[PDB]
Design a protein around this ligand. Sequence first.
Ligand SMILES: O=c1[nH]c(=O)c2[nH]c(=O)[nH]c2[nH]1
Length: 472
Amino acid sequence: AFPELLDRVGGRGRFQLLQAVALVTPILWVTTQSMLENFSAAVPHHRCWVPLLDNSGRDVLLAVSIPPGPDQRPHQCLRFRQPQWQLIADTEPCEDGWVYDHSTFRSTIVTTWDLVCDSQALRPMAQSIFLAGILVGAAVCGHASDRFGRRRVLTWSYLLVSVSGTIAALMPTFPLYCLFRFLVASAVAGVMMNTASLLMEWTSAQAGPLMMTLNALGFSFGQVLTGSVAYGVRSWRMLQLAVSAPFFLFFVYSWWLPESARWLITVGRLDQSLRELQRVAAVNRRKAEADTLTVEVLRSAMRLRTFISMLCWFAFGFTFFGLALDLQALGSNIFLLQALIGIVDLPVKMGSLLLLSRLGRRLCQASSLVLPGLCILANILVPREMGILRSSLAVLGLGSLGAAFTCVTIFSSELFPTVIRMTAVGLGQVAARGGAMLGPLVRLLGVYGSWLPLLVYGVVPVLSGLAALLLP
Ligand SMILES: O=c1[nH]c(=O)c2[nH]c(=O)[nH]c2[nH]1
């Protein structure tokens, strides 16, 4: 009977726009704190420290000091014991530390804590820890919004994000940085889930398309904001502080947003719900039917397809979050990538959905997975002679892959008895945030050929899309 009360008090109107913008704005920085593991932990070119060079023909000393490496570059993990002046066998690893290339990045975490050479596996583990934090935070926060309300949890998660992000930029050792990033990720997941729920509840029966489109648009613009901010600040200690500073002001101004009315009814807090409904009525300027709200009215108010959807969600999350955090090795000009993903995401998603919806829902679902799979797979075949083709295909593939997040949510998830769609979207998202755990760990397979990670990241979505055609 709550929709009757909502229609009595409003619907569309003015408040549902102000609240919408005030909740969409943090999504950009939420995206920023997730893809920030791309300009902070960036690996520049590194070499062994030499006593002859860098104080106690420069090319001649470079040749006589470091043995040549395989990839037409000086070796990054070995050094001559003595200057081999025979050059106009016995090699030994560094102890004096490495020297880095300070031309684009002033200081990275790899620069700070020397996560190179033997200690290489640690870098693709920070993102796995972050995704574990997101998964745990999303799992725990589910049974947290039924006892503590829904508006309070949002404010406390904003404060937690701000405090943990600020503190993490002041740690002197790696494990504490990983722990604070874990906390940041959990709080961010809580923020995202609560924002989605609060957007869903307060609006009318038209909640489906508009708000779920606005959330995706917020993520897409958050990508561009990440790119811009990264272009702005270059140091890594000054990047985390600059990114996490706004969240305190967000916690400050989110202290006045009306709490969800539907939840207050189910718990018996009738007086607060009545006051909240009256204030939204005053804001919406529909102070005509609010008289009928006289408390007594509210007192009286008080298996194949699941497998396929789970597989699609797992493939999307796995490949996307295992391939969207390594744009450094995918091309060049890292600031133009990660800032062209959303610009190639929104138009492609509107156009592809518009052109494909008419042909069929299953056709659109399958076509949104095999196409990016081949798009990614064709990247390894083309040579490095042309870089524009080396970069365009991957960008297009990632943009099309991002369209699956919308295609398998709004047009899909109806593959069920059709009672209500919120019983399956959460279960599908369980895999997504569980599969991205098993993501960047694939990049640990850089040894034993470098084409294997890309081959896997291309094969998995292709197989998922091909199997999606086997619904009957
Ligand atoms: O691969 C993803 N996993 C998620 O858990 C998630 N959440 C979100 O908003 N976008 C995505 N993408």
